[PDB]
Amino acid sequence: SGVAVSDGVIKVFNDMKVRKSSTPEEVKKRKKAVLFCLSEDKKNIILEEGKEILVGDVGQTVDDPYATFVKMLPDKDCRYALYDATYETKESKKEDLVFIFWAPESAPLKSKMIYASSKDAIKKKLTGIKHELQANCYEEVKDRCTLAEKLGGSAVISLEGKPL
Amino acid sequence: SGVAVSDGVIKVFNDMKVRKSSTPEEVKKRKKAVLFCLSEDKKNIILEEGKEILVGDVGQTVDDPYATFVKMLPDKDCRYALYDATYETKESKKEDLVFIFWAPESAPLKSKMIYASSKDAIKKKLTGIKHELQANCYEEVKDRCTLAEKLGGSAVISLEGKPL
Amino acid sequence: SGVAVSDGVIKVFNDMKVRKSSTPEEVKKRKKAVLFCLSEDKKNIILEEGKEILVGDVGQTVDDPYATFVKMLPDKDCRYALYDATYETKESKKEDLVFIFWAPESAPLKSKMIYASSKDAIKKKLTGIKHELQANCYEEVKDRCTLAEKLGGSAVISLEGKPL
Amino acid sequence: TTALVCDNGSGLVKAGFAGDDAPRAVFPSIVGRPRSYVGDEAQSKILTLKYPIEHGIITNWDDMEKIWHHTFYNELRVAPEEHPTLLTEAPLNPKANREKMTQIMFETFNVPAMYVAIQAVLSLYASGRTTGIVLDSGDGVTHNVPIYEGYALPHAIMRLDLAGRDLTDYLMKILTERGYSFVTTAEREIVRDIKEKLCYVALDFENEMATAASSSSLEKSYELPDGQVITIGNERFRCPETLFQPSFIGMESAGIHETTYNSIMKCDIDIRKDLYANNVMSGGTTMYPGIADRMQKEITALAPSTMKIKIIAPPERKYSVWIGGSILASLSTFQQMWITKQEYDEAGPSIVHRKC
Amino acid sequence: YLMKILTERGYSFVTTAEREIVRDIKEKLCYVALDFENEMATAASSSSLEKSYELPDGQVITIGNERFRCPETLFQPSFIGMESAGIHETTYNSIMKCDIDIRKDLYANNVMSGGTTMYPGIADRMQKEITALAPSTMKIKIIAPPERKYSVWIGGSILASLSTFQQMWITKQEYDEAGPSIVHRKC
Amino acid sequence: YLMKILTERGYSFVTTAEREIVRDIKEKLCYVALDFENEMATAASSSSLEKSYELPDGQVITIGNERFRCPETLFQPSFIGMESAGIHETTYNSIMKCDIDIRKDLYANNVMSGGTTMYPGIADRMQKEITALAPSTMKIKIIAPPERKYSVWIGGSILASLSTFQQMWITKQEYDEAGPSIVHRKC
Numbered sequence A, B, C: 001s002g003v004a005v006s007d008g009v010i011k012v013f014n015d016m017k018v019r020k021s022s023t024p025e026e027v028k029k030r031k032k033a034v035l036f037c038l039s040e041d042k043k044n045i046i047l048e049e050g051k052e053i054l055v056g057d058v059g060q061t062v063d064d065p066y067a068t069f070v071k072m073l074p075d076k077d078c079r080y081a082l083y084d085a086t087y088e089t090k091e092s093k094k095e096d097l098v099f100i101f102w103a104p105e106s107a108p109l110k111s112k113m114i115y116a117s118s119k120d121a122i123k124k125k126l127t128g129i130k131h132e133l134q135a136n137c138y139e140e141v142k143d144r145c146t147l148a149e150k151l152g153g154s155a156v157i158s159l160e161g162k163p164l
Numbered sequence D: 001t002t003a004l005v006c007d008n009g010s011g012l013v014k015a016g017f018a019g020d021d022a023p024r025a026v027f028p029s030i031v032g033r034p035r036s037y038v039g040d041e042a043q044s045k046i047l048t049l050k051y052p053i054e055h056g057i058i059t060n061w062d063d064m065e066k067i068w069h070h071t072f073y074n075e076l077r078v079a080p081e082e083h084p085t086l087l088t089e090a091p092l093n094p095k096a097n098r099e100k101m102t103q104i105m106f107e108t109f110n111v112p113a114m115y116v117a118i119q120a121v122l123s124l125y126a127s128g129r130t131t132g133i134v135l136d137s138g139d140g141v142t143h144n145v146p147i148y149e150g151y152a153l154p155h156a157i158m159r160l161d162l163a164g165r166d167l168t169d170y171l172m173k174i175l176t177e178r179g180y181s182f183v184t185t186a187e188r189e190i191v192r193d194i195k196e197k198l199c200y201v202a203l204d205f206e207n208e209m210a211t212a213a214s215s216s217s218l219e220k221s222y223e224l225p226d227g228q229v230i231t232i233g234n235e236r237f238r239c240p241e242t243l244f245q246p247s248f249i250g251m252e253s254a255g256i257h258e259t260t261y262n263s264i265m266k267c268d269i270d271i272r273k274d275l276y277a278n279n280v281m282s283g284g285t286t287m288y289p290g291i292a293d294r295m296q297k298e299i300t301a302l303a304p305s306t307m308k309i310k311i312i313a314p315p316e317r318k319y320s321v322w323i324g325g326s327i328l329a330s331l332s333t334f335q336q337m338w339i340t341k342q343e344y345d346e347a348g349p350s351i352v353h354r355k356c
Numbered sequence E, F: 001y002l003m004k005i006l007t008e009r010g011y012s013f014v015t016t017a018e019r020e021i022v023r024d025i026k027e028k029l030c031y032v033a034l035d036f037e038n039e040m041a042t043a044a045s046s047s048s049l050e051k052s053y054e055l056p057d058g059q060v061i062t063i064g065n066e067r068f069r070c071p072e073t074l075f076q077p078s079f080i081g082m083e084s085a086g087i088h089e090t091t092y093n094s095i096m097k098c099d100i101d102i103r104k105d106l107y108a109n110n111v112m113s114g115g116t117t118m119y120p121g122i123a124d125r126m127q128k129e130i131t132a133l134a135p136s137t138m139k140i141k142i143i144a145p146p147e148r149k150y151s152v153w154i155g156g157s158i159l160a161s162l163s164t165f166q167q168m169w170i171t172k173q174e175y176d177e178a179g180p181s182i183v184h185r186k187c
């Protein structure tokens, strides 16, 4: 295991999971999808301010929240993710968050072992999360059908405001 | 291989293995233990009418079915056998048939090779038989414990109506 | 046989084979390659303080640990040696010690027989050593490829921090 | 400061320092005795070879102390009492063995801090995965360990006695068919080198044999240490074929392609989908070129057609179990997770069960 | 499970031939302990519990704490991996499913059968577990006949050996008249 | 090895012609001792064990302790230099490799053949060594027919002299139909 989580990531998770009554001007800077990284010393899980996605921009500059999110993951390193999905089922309309464990084969072993052995140190601190998505290849995470297969299986008819 | 089986031996085996509802006067001439031999030309497996044991006589003239059966085997030639055993186990009382392959060392090689290479030609035609007893020395087949050791091992407490 | 080993050589071997946690100032005076000789009376195996190689100097004053070691062996007398090699294999990176038995033909027979018959008296006291290198000619020990041929054969791709 | 990682392999003990790319000390696990030379010394010398780790479980403890003493002194060349040593154990290891290992490590060598990890979870983490069945085909045994989010299911762990040792024995047996008589322990190393350098798993054994019986381009040439050049023909693919057809050796157990399917079908029904697409191979025996394609073909023949099978094979799967432990012990935040000697003195040998 | 736990000591029984030897060992040397956790404590220290079995090839293998661990799965199925409760709790769950007025005659009439219930000391463990599960007021009586292995066959043999049962059989004529559905009306 | 140990006394047999004489000496005067170490003790002191062989040229050479040392290599291959165990231990290693339930019929049915097993007293030594190796409970019976030298040929001759074997041969027509692979199906 080893690596633990910092206070900023826990604060961001508590901010994203539990939303409250907010003003229409502030509600547009909420966090939609944020990744997690390691510092220089590889001892804390820190979010990078560079790569991120806001809730405000979704549907505007970012035509597709998921489509613009696949290319945001670096293919030469291991990364965490937290995607807020809005999928439509035959039964009803749900809005859940997804934990994506990005781990390509092109990354070095030093970045794969650290992120694989410390996954229980981050997932345990993220209380209330259900949808877990482990993705190693890039083609499997690039496809749109896999998210509906993991979320609800064949029941999900539409994903992110558009049908499958 | 070579030597095959005749129709009489197959009929005798089908008569002994599968018994049916019979009259009390006829049931006493059933075949208990019959040996098998070769003709003058050594091309068919034939039973000799001379040496044999009836079911009727067992317990009367033949005090011991097995004891009177060891001396019936010639020590200067190779012979087949088919013994219907009635042994008592700790678990239950069983009644099975035993295939005894008699092959002493004092017999000539011409009678040993023929009976050893054609054993699969006779054993395959005897369907449903399980207990196989290969005996070469006379002392090993004369002993009573070996039959209980081959049939059920240490579990057989009594053999042929009498304890070990 | 005859000639035995002294306490100083055994202490030096135990000091070189088993290293411990040491200070950065003291770690630079460790023994890298030490030779063994005979006294005036030829009864004990003694190391000469004159010809030797430190671990500290390797990579500094001594550009090549092996290259500066061949000329250190006298060509007119028989000598022992103990070389700590750091070779790179295709499979992995190893760090072993090598026992070099230097015995030129130009040396007198009195120095060759004594060092050849008492080799089991020194090699037995050096526990845990594996790589044995017997060298008689000077050209065969001067070549760099022979060390990789004896250590790992064709598998050794690099020897002493530089490729073959 | 630096941590040691001594992988207790069935046929090769991998030892080194934390942070390196590969183990430093690699020697066969044998304890020679005449009728006590341990490890590499036994092969050079009239002795009866003994394996204390023959089948992944330490059955001869008396020689394990000598194995570890040799590994620490004559192989790693460092003092054990001044460097923490991480250890790995085979799956389905009893609690008594797990306690005896740490008790010996704490009482004989007096190492200040140690840690015991599972080979399966380390090999799975070394492939960037946390959920998936790992194929640990070593030198003595072949284990199929399905793991769920880093927790191996002990009830579905299949153990197979077919491994690289039986492959080397079968290669020795089939090389005498041509005329090459390798019977002694010295020639056994040459047979092992031939198996490592010239053997490969064929995509289709029956079809490959047809071309090998006619074509001549498949025959390779190996150079013996004495200079002789021996040629090997259809024995390149017949030797590793035993892993899929154990009838060659004589064991009734199914090949490594069917034991995996039998172990996957033994876990939960809802996690079988993440196990078919996360089959990871490890051990030195899985280093044959073309084994991943054969495994995928056999599983797709066995598994249902609807679900897909993805077989990933890292190029460093031979020492992945050691690289994982080395990276885990080289962490700057792992120095507080070790089992120090004080906690051992307080809690007895049972501390390893609570800590690990 | 016995085959799995015997390999922990070093005895590798993997083939079908050795499976019969494992079954014989289970039949001749296994027993249900009254208290598993307490028995394991004495087995880890004492040496008198270790038995010795003779293999068909002459080898003598010793079995230690595997005598009570193998039949313990019947009460703790976590050893095999199934989530279903042990045979001591499924009985209580089935008794609680019948009528409330007949539960009293079911707790005091628990009968065991089958070859698996032939372990010495299983009746005491079953009684202890049920008394732990069942209410304290009502009593639990567990009777175990010594012939419970073949009791299901002995019952049928005695029922078919009756001198007044020859008229209760299903003759072929009634079958020809009524089709295969005659067994539902007759039985 | 007999050629090597005969030169220790002074008899130099190096050529192929003298090799036949050495083979005749091995066939006519060699025997396996029941106990090699004990037999050597008596051979070093007693003189009745020394035999006398007549060379084809009329010379009479005497052989002493080389009568039992030559066939002793079959049980102690250290004499030749091979690390492989003797013929008494390879048999045990091969028996332990078969099924566990058929090992009992293999220990009591050890048959010896070939011209090398014609030494007088090899069956007793084999039985002693196996009983030392095999478990004590099961018994070892070693039968050695007096015609074991040509038994492999006598068996084939009797099999080919059968009046009912003329239809089991592989005729040339079946070969022409099926290629050389017919021998695999027929045999």
Ligand SMILES: Nc1ncnc2c1ncn2[C@@H]1O[C@H](COP(=O)(O)OP(=O)(O)O)[C@@H](O)[C@H]1O
Pocket (backbone or CB within 6 Å): D008, D009, D010, D011, D012, D013, D136, D137, D138, D139, D140, D164, D165, D168, D192, D195, D196, D197, D283, D284, D285, D287, D288, D318
């Ligand atoms: N490149 C290779 N090709 C074929 N076989 C190999 C190769 N490398 C190693 N092996 C085999 O792997 C075995 C060693 O496995 P090992 O690393 O001890 O497994 P474990 O660590 O699980 O015990 C050796 O017997 C060797 O035959």
Ligand SMILES: [Mg+2]
Pocket (backbone or CB within 6 Å): D009, D119, D136, D138, D283, D321
């Ligand atoms: Mg391994």
Ligand SMILES: [Mg+2]
Pocket (backbone or CB within 6 Å): E114, E152
């Ligand atoms: Mg029943």
Ligand SMILES: [Mg+2]
Pocket (backbone or CB within 6 Å): F114, F152
């Ligand atoms: Mg022959």
